[PDB]
Design a binder for these strands. Structure first.
Lengths: 141, 100, 95, 111, 145, 63, 143, 206, 63, 56
RNA sequence: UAAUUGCGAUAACGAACGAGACCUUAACCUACUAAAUAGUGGUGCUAGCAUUUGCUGGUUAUCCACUUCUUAGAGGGACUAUCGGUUUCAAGCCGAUGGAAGUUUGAGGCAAUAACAGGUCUGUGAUGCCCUUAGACGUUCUGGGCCGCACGCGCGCUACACUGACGGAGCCAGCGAGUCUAACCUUGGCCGAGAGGUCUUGGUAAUCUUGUGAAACUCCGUCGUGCUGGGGAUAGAGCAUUGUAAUUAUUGCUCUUCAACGAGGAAUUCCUAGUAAGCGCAAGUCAUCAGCUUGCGUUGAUUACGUCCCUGCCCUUUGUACACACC
């Protein structure tokens, strides 16, 4: 069978599933190429893993990611996390740990959140206020 | 003769050990199964003010009743289906069997 | 005390009802401001719609239209294009 | 009221609960209503074990001068409890070690 | 969407329906000045007159202006939907009108006076200067009096 | 205007009426070994550089 | 090497396809295209009042190709927006049923999309093939 | 530079701009330093960041924000006034436009002019409104470098917004000219004008 | 503020005074043996007891 | 036939109703709670009491 | 210490409630058990492009494999773990390392003795006393009123704009609710600008409404520094629904009308990170009616990281003519 792994990236309520396999180097998001991710301002945030690591490790790797849940920025972050984790997992599983180790060091030198899910989760709202900490305006007279 | 036996309750322990005994009874007689598949728990939530009169600070509280639902897929002749249905009954667990 | 008399209440009826330059930009083009803009756009190392309004007294709409036409002529080289802001230089051979 | 409350807490204590507490609120003797408490043993109020162990009941008794409220709280024996936890969450029962005799001469016991 | 040296045909102000109309604003937002025609009505009559939307009101021509005011005066003959008008059904005629300029002011004062002389509650409230559509007057709209 | 530069070597707790200012022990980078104590309006660790518009002034306490 | 609607910019694709329908002129343009608004939630007619129907048709064609199948209600929900109930805060209201249904009916007339099982509209074979043709045209005009 | 190819094309400009060295879209974090030995630690410059958008936790500690690039702090401060809260996409668009205008109006690095401006407009001494018997007395107090950076960014953004309020001049260009004025110490700069007023009143009430 | 409480401290000293030879320095080992050597009704309490036991093991090994 | 949520809430209110009726009618016999036994084509409710002879 | 949390001291020892401990919820699991009411992948059939070998899809009776995402249940995992400074060198504090999480891991539930002459007999068939009890204060029927407006005050919703308005595009969540012998959630089709009307459909519900295709947001356009395309308050005319019945307009929709407001005085509110704030969604009441509330999610900041100056809290000492207790 084709050498492949299945990874995911999460941020807030957004999840993304990335199928990674040996191939020719295509990156399609919901069937659309990576150069089509909106917003364009976070488009380079999406490119950040390949831009940091060099595409020689992307030359013969087929990756396709599908997203669901969350908002646009959350989906963008989920995408970048998913493809970073996919690269690390593939290099560990199919090539070696020297590859996985340099990959991990290069990734962490620029960001910790690519391999690590965002620990901050939304705080539940409490009664008496619109938000989770705010309260209704206090009037005495 | 396909049956998708579905259980629903509020007590996790009773519902789950009923499901376990059902699946163990089925497995030893070797009826085809698709696991005791567990639906997401349904939280019936009611929000109400603690004070019955309207005075005091504006306080709000939530009461939760959690509903757990399971179903087991089987195919079995009626002779063993009768024993499967009648073998185990526990309080608080609503049981119903359907065809296919 | 806090219980006001009926006269104090009726004072509400006497409280009464008292309580506590335009720009003239171009908007329409004409020959003088034509020649003015085509002579001064070879300058202004930074050019945008706001700079056009600032240094030529243009009507904003005419600023955007003139930006498009001068980009057609190639005298201003855009550095970026956006639906809410535009950026232009003098397309110099020195910079 | 005093005699009845004492009798009920005595009955619970002779039955074998870990604690009981009966409180009667209302007019009682005089017009100014008061509350009298008759606890004994020990009961808990806050921790989640209040759900498993405390059996609390309240009743209105209609008497000629008005209404008296009776609250009875019974904290039953955690060990007697048939199901659920067998003790309070802070109960740490350390089983006594079995005394070991130090060995001096290594040896082999054959098959 | 082009640069062109506008000739002396551009007048900086004009007169329509006894109401002055600005010339430096676009034709739609200039025609909004006539009371009784807003953004929707002025845009629709501009499109039905087929004058260029990008054109201001100052540099138009007398012919297009006359066509515009004619469409405004009588919309029905010019395939204007009956629901688009501000007088969808007149209080004493079965016809649908569209009142502009001083005419709509006159029609509004006759409306209020008619309500007053029939002694409807709406007319009574308009006579007294009060809220007519059942709002809460206990707390709002005080300084107007 | 001339300025002077000094690294902080130790912090000496908070001071001020609301506790919004801090006492620190600074030491001029040039002309070493002349240590003085100063107030600071803001967050401070050890080993920060602080620029003074006047060197020799001191403030032991603040109300 | 394979050209699909998913392979190009959504906005530029809809622009190109709307221009193509304008040039073709075979799309059934309704009578009140220049009169009414696209939803009660909006306040102004579309600004490019002559090609806006072509824009809408191109966008709904791209969306229908991208999706399994959609209907009038999904159309209004997508093309609606937040409207102010006066002073009261913005409430989300759907688009106009007449426009979002007439665009689909005209697109069926041209044959781009077909009424499909499970309800709703689903892209046609010919509509599909010409959509990828237009995508190829865009990927040609780009360079 | 080596042009590696892919089945899904990756732009040549992207490849040549970022793959060889962790640059920005147009600019580069290299050869960019700060003038102040007080700020060499708290400016975070000389660290590749690429886009100024990041979800990293910068508030867990009092000094955790020191590791944040001051470009991202700028973007954080552009969204402040009321309605603009959130909208970090708008913030990064504005800051990108500002850097573009900076490199249009001059030749040096935008991420050089910004650090020059903040180190020029950093308040070195402030006037604490401290309490007292009857009449409040101002007290001249030395400003920590982190507080210097914070107030510097604050005055920069407040001046940009107050200049852009209710006029044609958009926030991007107005903050660009505020940044050039703050780099060159212009009196037209709200940031340095306010910093000078604060330091001079501190000098008076030393 | 990570001060352990009376119940965990008393359980720790009780465990140590009668299971020193069977106790080790490895927190995981003490955690795993606690589940068999003492009846604790909570995993969190078990882990806290284990951690304090190892802390005291280090104390004894120091003196 | 009814939904599961409505079925279970109706079961709960039915339990409360039989309990409150049993404590309004059987308070003199040491009523101490009830349990509902539900089986298909058969349901029984077991009453815990002290004067079981009198409740009989 | 967050803590009467403990270390210790000790005429007190031994205890109890409280805090803690506990429980729920949100975060980690390539580990277990699995899953046509959640999926993915491959091979079938088929669409389009490539024409090609590959790309994106459609189709569940194409079957097969798996549980990564999704659901769960059983568990593990965090115990300040490890290191280094620091403290009768203890309790513990701080920095660094790892780790999903290292502020009680984050947020809540429960929550002590004593008390208020706090609120409620307009929830109660829970009642004492008093009153009324048949042209009753019971009940019912009809129509008004609880909204009435010279004014004042308290929650709030919109704004005063280019970090914008408007028009086109991209367009992605979660919490949860829903009818059957009674009418709910309603997809799809058709008509109508629109509200809406009509014929059907799936769902007693992870299966259908619903990927609630939400908004804010992004991109392309128009404007233009001003009472302007901001604001739509007040009014007129008309169009439908809910409801026996809308008028003292329920609400929705169309056109027209376009008022104050130019960042708001003395004062005052809330708040430490996914929190403030913005933006909507679900549900509650409901035949219809949200600007309200309970929750949910999207976008998502600077400043804190301390103190007793203002308002106060807890402990000890102290003085007292205070005890209904500084009012």
């Amino acid at each position: 069978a084709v050498p492949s792994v299945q990874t995911f990236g999460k941020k807030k309520s957004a999840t993304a599933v990335a199928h990674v396999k040996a191939g020719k180097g295509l990156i399609k998001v919901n069937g659309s190429p990576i150069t089509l991710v909106e917003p364009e301002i976070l488009r380079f945030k999406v490119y950040e893993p390949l831009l940091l690591v060099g595409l020689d490790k992307f030359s013969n790797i087929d990756i396709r990611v599908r997203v669901t849940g969350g908002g646009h920025v959350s989906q963008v972050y989920a995408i970048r996390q998913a493809i970073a984790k996919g690269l690390v997992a593939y290099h560990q599983k199919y090539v070696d740990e020297q590859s996985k180790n340099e990959l991990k060091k290069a990734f962490t030198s620029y960001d910790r959140t690519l391999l690590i899910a965002d620990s901050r989760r939304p705080e539940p709202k409490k009664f008496g206020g619109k938000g989770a900490r705010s309260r209704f305006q206090k009037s005495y007279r | 003769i396909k049956i998708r036996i579905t259980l629903t309750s509020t007590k996790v322990k009773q519902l789950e050990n009923v499901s376990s005994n059902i699946v163990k009874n089925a497995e030893q007689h070797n009826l085809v199964k698709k696991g005791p598949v567990r639906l997401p728990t349904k939280v019936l939530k009611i929000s109400t003010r603690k004070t019955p009169n309207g005075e005091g600070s504006k306080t709000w509280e939530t009461y939760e009743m959690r509903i757990h639902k399971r179903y087991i897929d089987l195919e079995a002749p009626v002779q063993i289906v009768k024993r499967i249905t009648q073998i185990t009954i526990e309080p608080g667990v609503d049981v119903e069997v359907v065809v296919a | 005390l806090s219980k006001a008399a009926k006269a104090a209440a009726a004072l509400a009826g006497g409280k009464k009802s008292k309580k506590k330059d335009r720009a003239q930009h171009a908007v329409i083009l004409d020959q003088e401001k034509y020649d003015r803009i085509l002579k001064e756009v070879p300058t202004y190392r930074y050019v945008s719609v706001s700079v056009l309004v600032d240094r030529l007294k243009i009507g904003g709409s005419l600023a955007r239209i003139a930006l498009r036409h001068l980009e057609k002529e190639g005298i201003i080289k855009p550095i970026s294009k956006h639906s809410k802001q535009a950026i232009y230089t003098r397309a110099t051979a020195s910079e | 009221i005093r005699r009845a409350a004492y009798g009920v807490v005595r009955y619970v204590m002779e039955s074998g609960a870990k604690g009981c507490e009966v409180v009667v609120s209302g007019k009682l003797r005089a017009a100014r209503a008061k509350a009298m408490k008759f606890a004994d043993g020990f009961l808990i109020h806050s921790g989640q074990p209040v759900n498993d162990f405390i059996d609390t009941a309240t009743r209105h008794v209609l008497m000629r001068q008005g209404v008296l409220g009776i609250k009875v709280k019974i904290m039953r024996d955690p060990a007697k409890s048939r199901t659920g936890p067998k003790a309070l969450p802070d109960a740490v029962t350390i089983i006594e070690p079995k005394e070991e005799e130090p060995i001096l001469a290594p040896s082999v016991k054959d098959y | 969407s082009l640069v062109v040296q506008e000739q002396g045909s551009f007048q900086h102000i004009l007169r329509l329906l006894n109401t002055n109309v600005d010339g430096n604003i676009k034709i739609v937002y200039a025609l909004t000045t006539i009371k009784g025609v807003g953004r929707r009505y002025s845009n629709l009559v501009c499109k039905k007159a087929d004058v260029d939307l990008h054109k201001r009101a100052g540099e138009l021509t007398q012919e297009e202006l006359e066509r515009i005011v004619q469409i405004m005066q009588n919309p029905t003959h010019y395939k204007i939907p009956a629901w688009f008008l501000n007088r969808q059904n007149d209080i004493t005629d079965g016809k649908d009108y569209h009142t502009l300029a001083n005419n709509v002011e006159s029609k509004l004062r006759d409306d209020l006076e008619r309500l007053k002389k029939i002694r409807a509650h709406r007319g009574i409230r308009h006579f007294w200067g009060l809220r007519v559509r059942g709002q809460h007057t206990k707390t709002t709209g005080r300084r107007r009096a | 205007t001339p300025v002077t530069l000094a690294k902080v070597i130790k912090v000496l707790g908070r001071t001020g009426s609301r506790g919004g200012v801090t006492q620190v022990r600074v030491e001029f980078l040039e002309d070493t070994s002349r240590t003085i104590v100063r107030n600071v309006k803001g967050p401070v660790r050890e080993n920060d550089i602080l620029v003074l518009m006047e060197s020799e002034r001191e403030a032991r306490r603040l109300r | 090497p394979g050209v699909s609607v998913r392979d190009v910019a959504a906005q530029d694709f809809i622009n190109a396809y709307a221009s193509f329908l304008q040039r073709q002129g075979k799309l059934e343009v309704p009578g009140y295209v220049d009169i009414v608004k696209t939803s009660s939630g909006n306040e102004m007619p579309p600004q490019d009042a002559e090609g806006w129907f072509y824009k809408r048709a191109a966008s709904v064609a791209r969306h229908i190709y991208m999706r399994k199948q959609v209907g009038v209600g999904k159309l209004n929900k997508l093309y609606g927006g937040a409207k102010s109930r006066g002073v009261r805060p913005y409430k989300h209201i759907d688009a106009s049923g007449s426009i979002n249904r007439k665009v689909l009916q005209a697109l069926e007339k041209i044959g781009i999309v077909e009424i499909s099982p499970k309800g709703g509209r689903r892209i046609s074979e010919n509509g599909q093939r010409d959509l990828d043709r237009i995508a190829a045209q865009t990927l040609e005009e780009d360079e | 530079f080596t042009p590696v190819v892919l089945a899904t094309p990756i732009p040549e400009e992207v490849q040549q701009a970022q793959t060889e060295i962790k640059l920005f879209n147009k600019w580069s974090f290299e050869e960019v330093e700060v003038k102040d030995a007080s700020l060499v630690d708290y400016v975070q410059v000389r660290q590749p960041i690429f886009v100024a958008h990041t979800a990293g936790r910068y508030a867990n500690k009092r000094f955790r924000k020191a590791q944040c690039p001051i470009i991202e702090r700028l973007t954080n401060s552009l969204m402040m006034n009321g309605r603009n809260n959130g909208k970090k996409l708008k913030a990064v668009r504005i800051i990108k436009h500002t850097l573009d205008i900076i490199n249009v109006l001059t030749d040096q690095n935008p991420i050089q002019v910004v650090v020059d401006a903040i180190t020029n407009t950093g308040p070195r001494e402030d006037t604490t409104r401290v309490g007292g018997g009857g009449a409040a007395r101002r007290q001249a107090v030395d400003v920590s470098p982190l507080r210097r950076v914070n107030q510097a960014i604050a005055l920069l953004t407040i001046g940009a917004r107050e200049a852009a309020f209710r006029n044609i001049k958009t926030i991007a260009e107005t903050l660009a000219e505020e940044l050039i004025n703050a780099a060159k110490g212009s009196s037209t700069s709200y940031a340095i004008k306010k910093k000078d007023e604060l330091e001079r009143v501190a000098k008076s009430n030393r | 503020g990570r001060v352990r409480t009376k119940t965990v401290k008393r359980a720790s000293k009780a465990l140590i005074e009668r299971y020193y030879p069977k106790l080790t320095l490895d927190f995981q080992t003490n955690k795993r043996l606690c589940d068999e050597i003492a009846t604790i009704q909570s995993k969190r309490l078990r882990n806290k007891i284990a951690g304090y036991t190892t802390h005291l093991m280090k104390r004894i090994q120091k003196g | 036939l009814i939904s599961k949520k409505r079925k279970l809430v109706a079961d709960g209110v039915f339990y409360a109703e039989l309990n409150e009726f049993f404590t309004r009618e059987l308070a003199e016999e040491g009523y101490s709670g009830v349990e509902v036994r539900v089986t298909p084509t058969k349901t029984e409710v077991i009453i815990r009491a002290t004067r079981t002879q009198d409740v009989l």
